[PDB]
Amino acid sequence: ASQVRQNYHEDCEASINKQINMELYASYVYLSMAYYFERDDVALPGFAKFFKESSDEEREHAQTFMKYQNKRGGRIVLQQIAAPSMREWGTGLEALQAALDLEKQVNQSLLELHSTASGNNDPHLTKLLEDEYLEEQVDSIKKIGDMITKLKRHHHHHEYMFDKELN
Amino acid sequence: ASQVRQNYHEDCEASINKQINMELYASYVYLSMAYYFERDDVALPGFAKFFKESSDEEREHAQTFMKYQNKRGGRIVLQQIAAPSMREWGTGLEALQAALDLEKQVNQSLLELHSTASGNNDPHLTKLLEDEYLEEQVDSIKKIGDMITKLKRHHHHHEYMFDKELN
Amino acid sequence: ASQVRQNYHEDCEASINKQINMELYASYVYLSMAYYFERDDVALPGFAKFFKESSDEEREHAQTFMKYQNKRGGRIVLQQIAAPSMREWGTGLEALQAALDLEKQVNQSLLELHSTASGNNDPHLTKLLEDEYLEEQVDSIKKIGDMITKLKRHHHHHEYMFDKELN
Amino acid sequence: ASQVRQNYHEDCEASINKQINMELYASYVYLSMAYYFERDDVALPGFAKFFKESSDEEREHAQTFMKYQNKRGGRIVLQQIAAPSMREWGTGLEALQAALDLEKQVNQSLLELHSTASGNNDPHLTKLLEDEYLEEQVDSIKKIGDMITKLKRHHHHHEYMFDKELN
Amino acid sequence: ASQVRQNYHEDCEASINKQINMELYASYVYLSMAYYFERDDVALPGFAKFFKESSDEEREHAQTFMKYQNKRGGRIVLQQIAAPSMREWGTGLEALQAALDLEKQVNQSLLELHSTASGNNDPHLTKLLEDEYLEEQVDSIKKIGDMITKLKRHHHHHEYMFDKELN
Amino acid sequence: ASQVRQNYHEDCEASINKQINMELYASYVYLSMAYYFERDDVALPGFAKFFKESSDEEREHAQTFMKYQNKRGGRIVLQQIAAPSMREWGTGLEALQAALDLEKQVNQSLLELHSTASGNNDPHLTKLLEDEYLEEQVDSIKKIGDMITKLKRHHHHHEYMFDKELN
Ligand SMILES: [Fe+3]
Ligand SMILES: [Fe+3]
Ligand SMILES: [Fe+3]
Ligand SMILES: [Fe+3]
Ligand SMILES: [Fe+3]
Ligand SMILES: [Fe+3]
Ligand code: NI
Ligand code: NI
Ligand code: NI
Ligand code: NI
Ligand code: NI
């Protein structure tokens, strides 16, 4: 097949492609939140900046996978990008909680993919998953947990303040 | 309705969401091309750079329409980003010609959107389109226009030289 | 008539004079709000500074219409500038809702002046309105919208904190 | 009344409000003059700049009195600003001659305001009038008088050259 | 036709070619004027510089339309440029008065070109005319009108001094 | 006649006017070639830039003859400037061969104008031609000669590579 392919189980190839789809999806969800917090009846510019940056991050995570698909000799197969789970994410706190669930869903995929790599004996791919994904994931789950706990005090005045620290 | 809405027809609100979806789809297609030209058996960096920047432009375009939705009081309704036409894009000349076609398609939409805004008497929305999309569209079409003319000379040696000046 | 006059219908020359008055009127309201929020039983330097900038901007928007009148061969007719009806504006939130209302009035007049310009096939005047008035108006309307949503969060303690991040 | 008021007779307070209104009227006259001298059938940029500056001067003198009213514990009451006498100011020499009489008019009211101030033994407010208003007024009257004798000389050629160093 | 053409009615295309030819004719007239004012029996370097600049201005306006014709997919067809009316332009005031009528002439054709553009629903080409041609034209007509009234005053001494600050 | 005129035969004054036309004609050909090589079905920015510089240079060579006419006491007579016969110039190689032919025409006229100058014992005019025209002409002719020999090497692929080293 490919002149570069060496020790790349087609099960791993297919899991990178499905994982490329998910980072684009999470990129799309954070892009909804980012601009939801810029509506004139929401106006939380800190939550908007926080989710814009995550939307760009997740789109970079998908591109690192695409670069990797080629490095190892696989063929990128892009599926559809599902519409985000909501249109209106509610308060900042509700927004963060969907992100916390969404971050952990990506973690359970990334940990399943690492299990696929470890089983087909791919150390290059376990190296990629640990150094460029599993670390960032556990870090961004922790950052949000801190945020969620800080934002739980009901109050709208308390949220406008915590917003000022995200800017 | 929202506090800020004035002279903003609901037909226009709905076209701007249609347009956000086309812009994001166009960004998806140029991301497909971009990394298709980074495959080991394609190996054209100059082309891959061009479609990477095109895919950022289109993503930048769709965000300016989302800022616009919120600017006017409209409400972003995000839909599914369909998967690209193809997964393999051919020679650079075939991808260029595919880019020219998608650029002229998006231009039809932007000109259709303009007539919808003239019809409803939204001069703020026609000024958005004239100053930020129709100029970028016509310019981009002519740039792709020239590139197809320089790249039609057969040879793959001509493609590799031309590639080295996109780079 | 005028050596420079060309394609300038008299119903546009008169809408520009009425508009120069209206801009001078809005300038006068923001001036009254500006020093109202500097009284010692009010003491809101962020609101005061905001409405001070807005008086200045609404004055310069009047002087741009006067430069334009002279530029086309028109003849400026200045009339009396009304005092605001109610100079006791209340809280910063009640003053902003009056700002939003007034900012939407001026937009309405500026849009009519444009429909007057388009019906007389004056592409110079429709361009003056699109660039220098309709854009600032929708922006100002959206920025005030955000402020009101933020400010209604009730408490004077919220207004004080909101005021400090307006300075 | 107020918690800052001390030795601020209400006849003083009333005749600051009156003076605010006069200063804004003068700002209006000079602004009328300023843009008159930019008519294409007048075309003296020196006088235009001169009166455009006096318009700013006088609007600032109004705000200094508005600041003073709050600083003392009186309440600002703004009034309708009258439209200027003319909206066609004639030659440059006539316009100066009008301005001289308006600056002599504003001087008379500032001396009356001072008389009211002393009779009521308000040394704070006579210092304000002497340092901020009465002294601008005499050099302003002397500057305008110097210009009038410089310009007396008939000729449009001599007004064109005077206008060159006013610029 | 072309591979870039989209929404470019051929009546627009024809009346850009016509306009190219008009702009080059104006470049020629002002160039005639420019070097006339350097005859040793005329000797006004201010007017020479002024029209020598307008000659450059207008030649650039031609090339912007030639660029526009290629950008849109029409074909440039150049025509013989007519010789100027005079080759002896008289006094400075007469030359301005000729220029005013030529700039008013070029304005009439640009508005017609705009009318053709809108009737055909080409928003790309009306934006071009408004941002690049119609607005240069009004200040140009206003600049030339200001000069004419400044120069009306008989005297060769007064033309010699006007000429000094045109330089 | 003229206060400055001295040793300027009328048959030289007329050859200079005919030459000012011819230079304006050559300027017009290079302008047409310049934007011809910018059409999207041609796409040669090196040739376009070359012939753009050559239009500009042939225009300034016209303005130097006009300065000279005035310098000697002559009287500029401007006539119509012909359009090129064929604006579809073909390949860059066919356009250059037409450039060489035209550049040799102007040399021929410039040499005749010199023989006219020498026969009338006008050492000023023969010096103007030797320094400012005959030198640039032989240089331009030789530079184009080199280009043609290089360009005829047939292939469009050679022309594209040649064009890039002309930019
Ligand atoms: Fe991720
Ligand atoms: Fe786009
Ligand atoms: Fe305004
Ligand atoms: Fe004053
Ligand atoms: Fe022009
Ligand atoms: Fe030449
Ligand atoms: Ni608090
Ligand atoms: Ni509480
Ligand atoms: Ni005299
Ligand atoms: Ni004199
Ligand atoms: Ni070969």
Q: How far apart are the CA of C74 and the nearest CA of chain E, in angstroms?
A: 12
Structure determined via:
X-ray
D148 lies within 8 A of chain E by CB = no
| Phi and psi based region of residue D6 (left: phi greater than 0; alpha: psi -120 to 50; beta: remaining) | beta
Which residue does chain B place closest to A69, by CA atoms? B39
Q: Report the C-alpha gap between F13 and F120 in whole angstroms.
A: 11
Tokens matching residue F123: 């050492």
A55 vs A5, A21, A111, B152, CA distance in Å? 32, 14, 21, 39
Residue carrying the six token digits 């040879």? B155
- The answer to whether the CB atoms of C127 and E130 lie below 8 A apart is yes
- Which fold would CATH assign to domain D10-166? Ferritin (1.20.1260)
**Those residues with Cβ within 8 angstroms of residue E14's Cβ, 6 or more apart along the chain or in another chain:** none
Q: Report the C-alpha gap between C26 and C99 in whole angstroms.
A: 9
CATH class of F10-165: mainly alpha
Q: Report the C-alpha gap between A147 and A143 in whole angstroms.
A: 6
Q: Report the C-alpha gap between E32 and E99 in whole angstroms.
A: 12
Which residues of D belong to the annotated binding site for Zn(2+)?
131
Measured between beta carbons, which residues in chain F are less than 8 angstroms from residue E77? Answer: 87
Q: Report the C-alpha gap between F94 and E1 in whole angstroms.
A: 24
Q: Which residues pair with E81 in a beta bridge?
A: F81
Over its C-alpha atoms, chain D yields an Rg (Å, rounded) of 18
Q: Report the C-alpha gap between B81 and E27 in whole angstroms.
A: 52
Q: Report the C-alpha gap between F147 and F162 in whole angstroms.
A: 9
3-state helix, strand, coil in chain D (%, to 5): 75, 0, 25
Buried/exposed E10-25: b ≥16 CB within 10 Å, e otherwise: eebbebbbebbbbbbb
According to DSSP H, which parts of C73-121 are helical?
92-119
Q: Is F87 helix (H, G, I), strand (E, B) or coil?
A: coil
Render B106-156 in DSSP notation, one character per residue.
HHHHHHHHHHHHHHHT-HHHHHHHIIIIIHHHHHHHHHHHHHHHHHT---H
Please tell me the number of the ligand nearest to residue C155's CA.
Answer: 8
| φ and ψ of B29, to 5 deg | -60, -50
Task: For chain C, give the number of residues.
Answer: 167
**Those residues with Cβ within 8 angstroms of residue D14's Cβ, 6 or more apart along the chain or in another chain:** none
Name the residue among E33, E140, E18 with its Cα closest to residue E84: E33
Known binder of ligand: residue F132? no
Query: What's the sign of the alpha-carbon dihedral D91, D96, D97, D99?
Result: positive
Q: Report the C-alpha gap between F73 and F2 in whole angstroms.
A: 6
Residue carrying the six token digits 């919120």? B70
Which chains does E contact via 3+ CB–CB distances below 8 A? Answer: B, C, D, F
Instruction: Tell me if E117 sits within 8 A of C110, measured CB to CB.
Output: no
Q: How far apart are the CA of F48 and the nearest CA of chain B, in angstroms?
A: 13
Q: Report the C-alpha gap between F39 and F87 in whole angstroms.
A: 12
Name the residue among F151, F160, F159, F4 with its Cα closest to residue F75: F4
C114 vs B71, C108, C120, C123, E124, CA distance in Å? 20, 10, 10, 10, 20
Q: Report the C-alpha gap between D8 and D11 in whole angstroms.
A: 8
Cα atoms found within 13 Å of the Cα of residue B26, Cβ hemisphere only: 28
Measured between beta carbons, which residues in chain E are less than 8 angstroms from residue F78? Answer: 28, 31-32, 83-84, 87
Question: Cα torsion for B108, B111, B113, B118, to the nearest 10°?
Answer: -160
Q: Is residue F164 classed exposed, middle or buried when 0-12, 13-18 and 19+ CB atoms within 10 A define those classes? A: middle
Instruction: Tell me if D151 sits within 8 A of D159, measured CB to CB.
Output: yes
Tokens matching residue F125: 């005019």
D101 vs B81, D62, D106, CA distance in Å? 72, 19, 9
Name the residue among F48, B73, F52 with its Cα closest to residue E60: F52
For residue F92, the CA-to-ligand 6 centroid distance in Å is: 20
Query: What's the sign of the alpha-carbon dihedral C82, C87, C91, C94?
Result: negative
Buried/exposed A78-105: b ≥16 CB within 10 Å, e otherwise: beebebbeeeebeebbebbbbbbebbee
**Those residues with Cβ within 8 angstroms of residue A90's Cβ, 6 or more apart along the chain or in another chain:** none
Considering only CB atoms, F40 lies closest to which of B146, B157, B165, namely B146
Measured between beta carbons, which residues in chain B are less than 8 angstroms from residue A63? Answer: 31, 35
Enter the DSSP assignment of E85: S
E112 lies within 8 A of chain C by CB = no
Name the residue among B112, B140, B87 with its Cα closest to residue B18: B112
Instruction: Tell me if D148 sits within 8 A of D100, measured CB to CB.
Output: yes
| φ and ψ of D39, to 5 deg | -60, 145
Tokens matching residue E40: 């040793």
- Named by the residue before each, gaps in chain D exceeding 2.5 A from C to N are 153
Q: Is A81 helix (H, G, I), strand (E, B) or coil?
A: strand
Task: For chain B, give the number of residues.
Answer: 167
Q: How far apart are the CA of D63 and the nearest CA of chain C, in angstroms?
A: 8
| Phi and psi based region of residue A22 (left: phi greater than 0; alpha: psi -120 to 50; beta: remaining) | alpha
| φ and ψ of F64, to 5 deg | -70, -35
Tokens matching residue E54: 């307008």
E96 lies within 8 A of chain D by CB = no
Which residue does chain C place closest to D38, by CA atoms? C70
Tokens matching residue F167: 């930019």
Name the residue among E152, E144, E162 with its Cα closest to residue E30: E144
Instruction: Tell me if A40 sits within 8 A of B2, measured CB to CB.
Output: yes
What's domain B10-164's superfamily in CATH?
Ferritin, core subunit, four-helix bundle (1.20.1260.10)
C99 lies within 8 A of chain A by CB = no
D159 CA to centre of own chain: 24
**Ion ligand 4 — residues with CB < 5 Å:** D 23, 58, 61
Residue carrying the six token digits 């008009």? E22
Name the residue among D51, D63, D71, D55 with its Cα closest to residue D20: D63
Q: Report the C-alpha gap between A150 and E127 in whole angstroms.
A: 51
Q: Is D81 helix (H, G, I), strand (E, B) or coil?
A: strand
Domain extents for chain C?
A: 10-165
Q: How far apart are the CA of E3 and the nearest CA of chain C, in angstroms?
A: 31
Tokens matching residue D97: 């001659």
Considering only CB atoms, C70 lies closest to which of D39, D63, D76, namely D39
**Those residues with Cβ within 8 angstroms of residue C96's Cβ, 6 or more apart along the chain or in another chain:** C144, C147, C148, C151
Measured between beta carbons, which residues in chain D are less than 8 angstroms from residue E138? Answer: none
Q: Which residues pair with B81 in a beta bridge?
A: A81
Measured between beta carbons, which residues in chain E are less than 8 angstroms from residue F26? Answer: none
Number of H helices, E strands in chain C: 6, 0
| φ and ψ of B39, to 5 deg | -75, 150
Q: Report the C-alpha gap between E151 and D160 in whole angstroms.
A: 9
Enter the DSSP assignment of A40: T
